[PDB]
């Protein structure tokens, strides 16, 4: 039951971590352990895809 419930979301999420232009998967190094820093920053988002690469299901 839990497999059929929570696997399609896992498949979708892992298909959303694959950047076609750079290949592979993307992960960011969180720093736990206070639990974490009060402040955070997201400087820029580089081009994961290109207009000529997008295909629609």
């Amino acid at each position: 039951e839990t497999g059929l419930h929570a696997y399609p979301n896992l498949a979708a999420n892992v298909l959303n971590i694959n950047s076609p232009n750079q290949g592979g998967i993307i992960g960011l190094p969180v720093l736990p352990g206070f639990n974490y820093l009060p402040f955070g920053m997201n400087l820029a988002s580089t081009a994961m895809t290109l207009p000529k690469q997008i295909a629609y299901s």
Partner: peptide, 10 residues
């Protein structure tokens, strides 16, 4: 990915 604590872990 660059950037520190963009989403923090829960």
């Amino acid at each position: 990915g660059l950037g520190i604590n963009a989403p923090p872990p829960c």
